[PDB]
């Protein structure tokens, strides 16, 4: 092949990679303990070492055996891969490594991760599996791994809330993290208001940025869909009022109308409240037919000076 | 400490998280998830075979000792 | 996080919940039989 | 995906049921030291 992505991968290292990739837990344990000429950082034809192979195939036991081994490389990429695949137990095991518990890599900003030059979240001699600006919390929000997002939030990770080309990609990635339901529902105290404001902000950004108009339109649509779903999950009048009136003035209905959130206002849970307010004192006229309404319109037309 | 609105919002947000997880469980299964289950079967096979290898080795030791006693 | 859906979920209860969630039948049987400081109604993060 | 998760949990429960520690009968078979 014209590209050597990975020497010769001696039989010991090849056997170790074969055992780790296909979950031969006893063999990988035996090779980690007894063997002395084996380096745990040997890589296969694609440059994936034992840890990345075990994480990719969801081998929690092999992952635990490798994490107990010192001088294990590609730990950050293993965490990112596990977050991408939504392997909650593997992510939890990796987050207990001294590379995360002792350090503050989750807490620090993506810009701080870019200025610290830690070569941590890298998966080969040069380059990372995902964009260099994608922190673990941003990736978990991307993939909508609710439990992973909750674990990272407990760890203290937050989304940044922000070449001339990688900067736009970084901003779009940060907004994809922010505009996901997994982060909107788990981060803020008032997710509906935050999602409405974020939908407005993303619509404005789509207006400003024309090349990436589709991306910001999609993110705004995600925020609108989250608000609509939260409204839909209401089961009594109190929850509907809380979603509509906010913390009776329909503050969130007016916000949705201003922010062009159409399905929120058009939702039956919102429509029933709007109809109740629409017929304030005309309770009996709500269910009358169109003919009776036209007749009452004609009566009002006849008697409008009298009514005034 | 939490007000009534905070309790209502917490209920609705937990309900939304559970509904989203349920809807994710209703997504069509991809090939990667089947590969994950196949790898689970593979690791289970290796663990079970090594368990047997250990049980047979233990039984072999008792025989060897007993054979020597005879 | 702003919302706490669930204390500190002591290690015994944490391992009991891990065993029950992933069907570790021997462990859940052992903890329901012998363990006396175990609250079977302990809840996880959700 | 829910049914596949159910099957994965079935595999996990089977693993935990098969890998139970029952190596005690064999330990008690050390009454061969009482030859």
């Amino acid at each position: 092949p014209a590209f050597m992505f990975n020497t010769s991968l001696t039989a010991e290292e090849e056997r170790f990679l074969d055992a780790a990739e296909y979950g031969n837990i006893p063999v990988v344990r035996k090779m980690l303990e007894e063997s002395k000429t084996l380096n745990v950082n040997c890589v296969d034809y694609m440059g994936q070492n034992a840890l990345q192979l075990a994480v990719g195939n969801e081998h929690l036991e092999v992952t635990e055996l490798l994490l107990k081994k010192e001088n294990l490389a590609r730990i950050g990429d293993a965490l990112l891969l596990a977050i991408s695949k939504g392997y909650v137990r593997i992510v939890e095991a990796i987050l207990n490594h001294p590379g995360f518990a002792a350090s503050k890599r989750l807490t620090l900003s993506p810009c701080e991760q870019e200025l610290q030059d830690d070569d941590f979240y890298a998966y080969d001699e040069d380059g990372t599996r995902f964009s260099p600006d994608i922190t673990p919390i941003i990736l978990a929000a991307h993939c909508q791994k609710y439990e992973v997002v909750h674990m990272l939030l407990m760890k203290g990770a937050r989304i940044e809330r922000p070449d001339s080309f990688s900067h736009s990609r970084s901003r779009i990635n940060a907004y994809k993290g922010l505009a996901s339901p997994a982060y909107l529902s788990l981060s803020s105290e008032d997710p509906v208001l935050t999602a409405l404001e974020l939908s407005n902000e993303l619509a404005k950004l789509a207006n400003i940025e024309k090349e990436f108009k589709n991306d910001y339109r999609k993110l705004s649509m995600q925020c609108k869909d989250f608000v609509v779903g939260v409204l839909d999950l209401c089961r009594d009048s109190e929850e509907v009022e809380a979603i509509l009136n906010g913390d009776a003035s329909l503050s969130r209905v007016k916000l949705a109308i201003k922010y062009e959130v159409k399905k929120f206002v058009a939702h039956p849970n919102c429509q029933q409240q709007l109809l109740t307010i629409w017929y304030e004192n005309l309770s009996g006229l709500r269910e009358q037919t169109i003919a009776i309404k036209c007749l009452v319109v004609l009566v009002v037309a006849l008697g409008l000076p009298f009514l005034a | 400490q939490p007000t009534r609105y905070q309790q209502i919002m917490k209920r609705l947000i937990k309900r939304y998280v559970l509904k989203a997880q349920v809807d994710k469980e209703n997504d069509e299964v991809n090939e990667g998830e089947l590969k994950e289950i196949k790898q689970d079967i593979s690791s289970l096979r290796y663990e079970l075979l090594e368990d047997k290898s250990q049980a047979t080795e233990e039984l072999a030791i008792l025989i060897h000792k007993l054979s020597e006693k005879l | 996080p702003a919302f706490m859906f669930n204390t500190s979920l002591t290690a015994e209860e944490e391992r009991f919940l891990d065993a029950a969630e992933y069907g570790n039948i021997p462990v859940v049987r052992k903890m329901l039989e012998e363990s006396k400081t175990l609250n079977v109604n302990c809840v996880d993060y959700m | 995906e829910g049914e596949l998760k159910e099957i994965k949990q079935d595999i996990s429960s089977l693993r935990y049921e098969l890998l139970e520690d029952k190596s005690q009968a064999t330990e008690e078979l050390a009454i061969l030291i009482h030859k």
Partner: nanobody, 122 residues
Framework: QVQLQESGGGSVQSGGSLRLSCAASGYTYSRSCLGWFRQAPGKERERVATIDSDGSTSYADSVKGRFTISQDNAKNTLYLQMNSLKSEDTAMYYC????????????????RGQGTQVTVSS
């Protein structure tokens, strides 16, 4: 390879208490085993107490209810707590670690530690 040097060595009056500690790596998901073993002078090696990967502990009938095998959350160190340390509980205690779920079977354990020294005065 991994030098452990089981600690807790010392002497104590019979009927008291003492604590041991061994640097044994334990695993929560992988099926591993950790345990303490008793090599009494004149007698032979026996199984004091063993702890499975899931935390399940098995104690010898002699030391049932008196000893408590336990470890840290990191599971990089193995702790043995002795209470009411009588005359019988005296030996060159060793620390062992094997793979698998057959934790309560003495065979297969690796005694790669030098050992500790505990004795009781009557």
């Amino acid at each position: 390879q991994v030098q452990l040097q089981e600690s807790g060595g010392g002497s104590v009056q019979s009927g008291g208490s003492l604590r041991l500690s061994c640097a044994a790596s334990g695993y929560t998901y992988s099926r591993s085993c950790l345990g303490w073993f008793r090599q009494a002078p004149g007698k032979e090696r026996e199984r004091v107490a063993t702890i499975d990967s899931d935390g399940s502990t098995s104690y010898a009938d002699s030391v049932k209810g008196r000893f408590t095998i336990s470890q840290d959350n990191a599971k990089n160190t193995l702790y043995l707590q002795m209470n009411s340390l009588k005359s019988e509980d005296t030996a060159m205690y060793y620390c062992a670690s094997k793979y698998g779920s057959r934790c309560q079977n003495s065979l297969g354990y690796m005694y790669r530690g030098q050992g500790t020294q505990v004795t009781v005065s009557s």
